[PDB]
Design a protein around this nucleic acid. Structure first.
Ligand code: ZN
Lengths: 146, 147, 98, 195, 186, 73, 73, 89, 81
DNA sequence: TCCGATCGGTACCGGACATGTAAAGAGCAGACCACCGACAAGT
DNA sequence: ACTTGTCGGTGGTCTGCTCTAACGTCACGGCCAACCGATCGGA
């Protein structure tokens, strides 16, 4: 799931020294605090508690500790697909974005009437890598936006 | 103020330091706006009553004078002139800079007026006024030639 | 030449002719002019009052140029009188009808 | 400076620009520009034209070029940058108080650094910060990156107040909200007269 | 440090002998002036050499209202103060004392010059303590603690916690956009 | 449809005013006035009615003494 | 063009919150003394819930549900 | 009708004079904060001498507090001997 | 020139008729008889003496903060007691 | 003579709204107020 | 007989300044991702 994926990504937490490390694992949800009708009547938030087991590891001594950590009240979706926030139902609208990958585009100049081809590499949370061909037939790479 | 038909001209021009300190009724010294407890404007701050004017009508900071009969006088303890509270949008202050600062309008413009006046390239002006390169203000040609 | 007009600048035809008439008599060599066609965007910003030009477009540049030139606004126009709340010099606002 | 100390005097920052403007000779520069424009030709002619325009603008009027370097920064009256308390106890600022506070803080820190006797590097850095703060106060965004407040929102300065469709001229001078006004849906009435 | 102390002592002796004293020899005056100038140069060199510790310390406080450069300048002031009070007789390295003074200066400046409405440090400490107690109670109980629990664990009246929470808010901006498009302002 | 005159009708004779600029607020819920935009000013100038434009600009929007004097008159 | 549903948006917000919490943990690790550190004294759960609440109350993609009729919802 | 009032003359250090109105039944302060932010006095034959403020702490005071005179004298003598040996061999 | 009995009567009436705590400065400015004090210390001593005399007569004066958001203390006489 | 940067602009009426973190603590001093003792002169 | 200006003391609260001694030494973060037209400064 999403929580398991993000906790697995965040599991390696080591400083520059690298003598200590903190790990997160096994997210868990508890029973809902209150029903939908009560939340709407009392102007509350339809949420459920979240518990994450955290382990602290010390490399120099090899001693480890395990404890249960409370993460907060995570809002929960009702059966109708709406989130109750402060007694008012809110709906999250999906978003359309361009998927990461490589894209090739062709442009035609109005000066020499010659076609120019460029390729843009669009990653997720990363720098941009581009290549292009000019009128002088010289391939150029533009790392980031330089 | 009144009789709009009596306005003949609306002249604009550069303001020198003398005009800037003639406009202001006082100098602000601290970056304070209001007290966190009593919600009252501080002294010598951005909202000082002694500098810009009273918040209440015909009342001073310490409350010594609270009557309309005290018109145009200045309280001898808090310094707040007892007048109307509508003067808080007509009085200005000024800040005494410890080092001169150039005006952004006349430097970072297309074309750069300072550059045209001093025959300096915009990059040279940017380096000079942002502490990146030294500029020779003057040179004693006669002394250099003699020795 | 001997006129006060800066070379390469754009001046009104009436003002240019008046200056030439002033220079030719008890003066020196008159200036020479050539007709110039200007767009609407450029002609509006070249008005004699900095207030209308500042209200129209490019407020920063117009204000800077007016401040440097120390230009004076005579307050005779529809937009300038609209801004300051005075009667416009058109329709019933002229001296003949008021 | 170490070897040929008593032969020149060079500075860095706005003080050097102020000294250059003080030593500037308007009449000689104007005469040289007129000679160049009436004698020379080529690409230099356009630059001579522009410089002559600027110098004549500074010469014909009664003002002086010393107004481009500031020694005192005026402060807008408090009512134009109100500090009001919204319902619920929350306060609101006009986004100018932050800029004024930054300028005042940097000026006071510069005063303290000069008083203590800090080395040249620290004093120069503080003066550069003061220059940047003043430039951001007068017009935010012209040089460098805009100053961002909470929520990564650039702050609104005086130039932003005077510019754009949301500026003073186009929002509160050429068009105002009036009293004695109404608004409602319209229907068609055939029994009415033309007036 | 020895050069700085020698220069300070030479300057003090020259000042004392200048008024109500006697005509110092020319060679002695030259020696005193040279010692004072050497002390000043040594102090400047010591200040310039340790300007990276300030940057290292001020890195951790970025993003708490104060700008990075302001934090650097306050750390530099703390470094100057540490240089003034540094003693070499104990033999401890200058890094520890410099770190202590830089941390103190940065913390004090960030406590003062970071809010539109200033809050005294003696109350910022109380706010921080209340926040720490609230976090501890939240972790221990598993739910948001009530004001009664905070008052019980902070040995204060149930009314002071509400006042402290009221003092902790920050003013919103009047120029923020209300609608989706930038046509209306608060 | 949900476009009813019970919610769209609006009128104002004298109501709240803003702080930085002494102008009436906007919106039915805030009892504000109707904006007299730039195009309406152009239309009034084209007609030739100077006095109506002057009154609309000054004594209904911004003239602080003018508003109370007009109401008293 | 891919579609980011509610799940991916909430996952991104939780990722931002966890990154801030990791930064706080790293900052606290270099200051506290060893042999006296427990997992609970290092974990600061405020940023995660703060980010979730900020997303639910401020993001443009979190809008009030239209309830004129079931079709609108 | 307006209440009578008096005018007090204050002079700053850099030759600036400002007028501050005061009531008849009031105590005119000796020193007043002028319009330019600089403290000014009242121009009168009998000067109301105000309170005097002693200078604050400085680097030398801290050095003297954290050290002793004898050790500083010994260090200065050592430095003088070193510079003398370096200069005249 | 106000007699002491009149001053005490004014003070007790002002305390009884005011539903909020009043600091010393407000009593000095408002209640008659306290405007003739040559110095602040003299006024404070006179007010302390008058308050002690009133408390000796059994009047239950109550002292507390002016407001929950302010630190200055005020005076109020409970009407029920 | 050509061209990589930089700045200027892009309709209107109606409506809507308000922040999310803090590495601390101790010692000494200054200003102000609620509680008080004396002591002679005016009332 | 009663009262008050003048003098001095305690304890509490709010506010500000100075100090702390193992060793510690040059930041991520990156939007931008439109479109057309005009102008000044390098190559
Ligand atoms: Zn007063």
């Amino acid at each position: 799931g999403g929580l398991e994926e993000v906790l697995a990504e965040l599991s390696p937490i080591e400083d520059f020294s690298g003598s200590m490390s903190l790990s997160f694992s096994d997210p868990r949800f508890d029973e809902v605090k209150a029903s939908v009708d009560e939340c709407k009547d009392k102007d509350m938030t339809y949420a459920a508690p979240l518990f994450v087991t955290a382990e602290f590891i010390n490399n120099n001594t090899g001693e480890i500790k395990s404890q249960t950590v409370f993460m907060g009240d995570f809002p929960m979706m009702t059966e109708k697909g709406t989130f109750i926030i402060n007694g008012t139902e809110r709906v999250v609208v999906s978003q359309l974005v361009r998927s990461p990958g490589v894209y090739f585009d062709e442009t035609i100049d109005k000066s020499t009437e010659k076609t120019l081809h460029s390729v843009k590499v669009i990653p997720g949370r990363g720098a941009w890598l581009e290549f292009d061909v000019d009128k002088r037939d010289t391939v150029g790479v533009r790392i980031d936006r330089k | 103020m009144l009789d709009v038909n009596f306005f003949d001209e609306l002249r604009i021009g550069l303001a020198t330091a003398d005009d800037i300190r003639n406009w202001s009724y006082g100098e602000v010294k601290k970056p304070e706006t209001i007290n966190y407890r009593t919600l009252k404007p501080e002294k010598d701050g951005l909202f000082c009553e002694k500098i810009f004017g009273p918040t209440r009508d015909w009342e001073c900071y310490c409350g010594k004078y609270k009557r309309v009969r005290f018109k145009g006088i200045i309280c001898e303890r808090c310094g707040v002139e007892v007048t109307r509270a509508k003067v808080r949008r007509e009085r200005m202050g000024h800040i005494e800079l410890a080092a001169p600062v150039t005006h952004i309008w006349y430097f970072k413009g297309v074309p750069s007026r300072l550059g045209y006046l001093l025959d300096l390239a915009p990059k040279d002006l940017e380096k000079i006024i942002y502490f990146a390169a030294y500029v020779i203000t003057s040179v004693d040609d006669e002394m250099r030639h003699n020795e | 030449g001997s006129t006060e007009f800066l070379p390469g600048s754009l001046t009104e035809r009436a003002e240019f002719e008046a200056e030439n008439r002033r220079v030719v008599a008890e003066g020196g060599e008159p200036a020479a002019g050539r007709p110039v066609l200007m767009g609407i965007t450029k002609a509006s910003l070249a008005t004699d009052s900095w207030l209308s030009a500042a209200s129209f477009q490019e407020t920063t540049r117009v204000l800077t140029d007016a401040a440097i030139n120390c230009r004076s606004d005579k307050l005779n126009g529809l937009k300038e009188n609209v801004i300051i709340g005075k009667l416009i010099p058109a329709g019933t606002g002229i001296s003949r009808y008021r | 400076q170490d070897r040929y100390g008593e032969y020149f005097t060079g500075a860095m920052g706005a003080e050097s620009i102020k000294k250059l403007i003080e030593n500037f000779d308007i009449d000689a520069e104007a005469e040289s520009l007129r000679e160049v424009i009436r004698s020379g030709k080529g690409q230099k002619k356009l630059r001579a034209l522009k410089r002559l325009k600027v110098v004549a603008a500074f010469q014909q009027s009664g003002n002086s070029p010393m107004g481009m370097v500031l020694d005192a920064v005026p402060v807008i009256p408090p009512e134009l940058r109100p500090m009001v308390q919204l319902d619920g106890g929350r306060f609101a600022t006009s986004d100018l108080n932050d800029l004024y506070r930054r300028v005042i803080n940097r000026n006071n820190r510069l005063k303290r650094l000069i008083d203590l006797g800090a080395p040249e590097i620290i004093v120069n850095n503080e003066k550069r910060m003061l220059q940047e703060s003043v430039d951001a106060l007068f017009d935010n965004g012209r040089r460098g990156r805009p100053v961002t407040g909470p929520g990564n929102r650039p702050l609104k300065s005086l130039s932003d107040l005077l510019k754009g469709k949301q500026g003073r001229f186009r929002q509160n001078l050429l068009g105002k909200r009036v009293d004695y006004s109404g608004r409602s849906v319209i229907v068609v009435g055939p029994q009415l007269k033309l007036h | 440090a020895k050069r700085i102390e020698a220069g300070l002592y030479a300057t003090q002796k020259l000042a004392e002998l200048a008024e109500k004293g006697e005509k110092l020899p020319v060679q002695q005056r030259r020696d005193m002036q040279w010692i004072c100038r050497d002390g000043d140069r040594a102090k400047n060199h010591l200040l310039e050499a340790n300007l990276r510790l300030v940057v290292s310390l001020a890195k951790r406080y970025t993003g708490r209202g104060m700008a990075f450069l302001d934090l650097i300048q306050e750390g530099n002031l703390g470094l100057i103060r540490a240089v003034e009070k540094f003693d070499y007789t104990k033999g401890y390295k200058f890094s520890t004392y410099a770190t202590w003074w830089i941390r103190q200066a940065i913390t004090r400046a960030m406590a003062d010059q970071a809010r539109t409405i200033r809050i005294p440090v003696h109350m910022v400490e109380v706010i921080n303590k209340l926040g720490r107690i609230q976090r501890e109670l939240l972790q221990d109980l598993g739910r948001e603690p009530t004001p009664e629990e905070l008052a019980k664990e902070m040995d204060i009246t149930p009314e002071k916690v509400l006042e402290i929470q009221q003092y902790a808010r920050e003013p919103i901006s009047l120029d923020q956009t209300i609608g989706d498009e930038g046509d209306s302002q608060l | 449809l949900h476009h009813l005159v019970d919610d769209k009708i609006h009128a104002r004779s004298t109501g709240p005013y803003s702080m930085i600029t002494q102008q009436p607020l906007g919106g039915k819920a805030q009892f504000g006035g109707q904006r007299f935009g730039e195009m309406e000013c152009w239309a009034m100038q084209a007609y030739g009615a100077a006095y109506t434009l002057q009154e609309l600009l000054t004594i209904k929007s911004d003239d602080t003494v003018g508003r109370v004097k007009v109401y008293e008159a | 063009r891919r579609l980011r549903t509610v799940g991916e948006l909430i996952q991104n917000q939780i990722r931002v919150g966890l990154s801030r919490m990791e930064r706080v943990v790293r900052e606290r690790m270099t200051t506290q003394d060893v042999e006296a550190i427990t997992p609970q004294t290092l974990i600061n759960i405020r940023p995660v819930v703060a980010a979730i609440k900020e997303f639910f109350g401020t993001s443009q993609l979190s809008q009030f549900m239209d309830q004129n009729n079931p079709l609108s919802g | 009708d307006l209440a009578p009032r008096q005018v007090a003359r204050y002079r700053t250090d850099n030759g600036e004079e400002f007028d501050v109105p005061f009531a008849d039944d009031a105590e005119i302060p000796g020193t007043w904060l002028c319009r330019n932010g600089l403290e000014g006095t009242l121009i009168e034959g009998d000067v109301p001498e105000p309170k005097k403020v002693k200078p604050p702490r400085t680097h030398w005071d801290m050095l003297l507090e954290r050290r002793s005179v004898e050790e500083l004298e010994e260090l200065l003598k050592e430095r003088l001997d070193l510079i003398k040996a370096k200069r005249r061999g | 020139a106000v007699s002491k009995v009149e001053r005490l009567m004014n003070l007790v009436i002002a305390l009884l008729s005011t539903r909020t705590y009043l600091p010393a400065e407000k009593i000095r400015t408002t209640v008659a008889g306290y405007a003739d004090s040559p110095s602040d210390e003299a006024f404070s001593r006179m007010f302390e003496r008058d308050k002690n005399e009133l408390r000796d007569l059994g009047i239950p004066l109550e002292t507390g903060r002016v407001s929950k958001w302010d630190s200055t203390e005020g005076y109020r006489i409970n009407r029920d007691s």
